[PDB]
C-alpha cells in the first residue's frame, strides 16, 4: 500500500492427497477428491511434503 | 443462536524436538447447512450423496 507497509491478504493453501491417482477429474482443468483419494491434507507451500 | 457446547480434545498430541509447533491434524464434528450436489454408488455399494 501507499503507507510504506504491506498487509497479508491470504496465503495459498496447497493440498496433497493419500494417493494422487484417486481424484476424479472434472469438466475443467480442475479435479475433485473422492473416496478413492480420501480427504485432502491441507497445508502451506514449502512446508512438510507440500 | 445459543452457543455450541463441544468437547475440544488435544488427544494424540506429542512434544517434538525439531522444527516449529505445527497443527498436524484438526477435526470437528459439525457442519454448514447444505442440500445435495451428487449421489453415487461406491465399489462396495455405499450410496453416498455428496
Amino acid at each position: 500500500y501507499s503507507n510504506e507497509q504491506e498487509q497479508v491478504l491470504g496465503q495459498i493453501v496447497l493440498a496433497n492427497f493419500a494417493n494422487n491417482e484417486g481424484l476424479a477429474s472434472q469438466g475443467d482443468n480442475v479435479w475433485a477428491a473422492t473416496q478413492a483419494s480420501g480427504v485432502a491434507l491441507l497445508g502451506t507451500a514449502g512446508s512438510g511434503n507440500f | 443462536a445459543t452457543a455450541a457446547t463441544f468437547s475440544l480434545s488435544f488427544l494424540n498430541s506429542m512434544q517434538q524436538n525439531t522444527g516449529a509447533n505445527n497443527i498436524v491434524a484438526t477435526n470437528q464434528n459439525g457442519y454448514k447447512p447444505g442440500d445435495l450436489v451428487s449421489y453415487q454408488i461406491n465399489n462396495d455399494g455405499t450410496v453416498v450423496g455428496n
Binding site: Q7, V8, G10, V13 | I23
Partner: protein, 50 residues
C-alpha cells in the same frame, strides 16, 4: 473477479487461509476462505507499542 476474488478463468475461486486482525496475520488454521484483495484503504490505527 470483478469483486476481486482471485479466480482462474473458469470462474472457480482460488482459496487460501484468511488473514484477520490489525495487522493481519496468516491464520494457519485449515479453514480456507476465498482470497479477496480489496480496493479500500488501509485505515490508520494508533501505535500500540514502540
Amino acid at each position: 473477479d470483478e469483486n476481486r476474488n482471485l479466480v482462474n478463468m473458469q470462474g472457480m475461486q482460488l482459496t487460501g487461509y484468511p488473514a484477520t486482525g490489525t495487522p493481519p496475520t496468516i491464520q494457519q488454521g485449515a479453514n480456507p476462505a476465498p482470497i479477496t484483495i480489496p480496493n479500500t484503504l488501509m485505515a490508520a490505527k494508533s501505535t500500540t507499542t514502540a
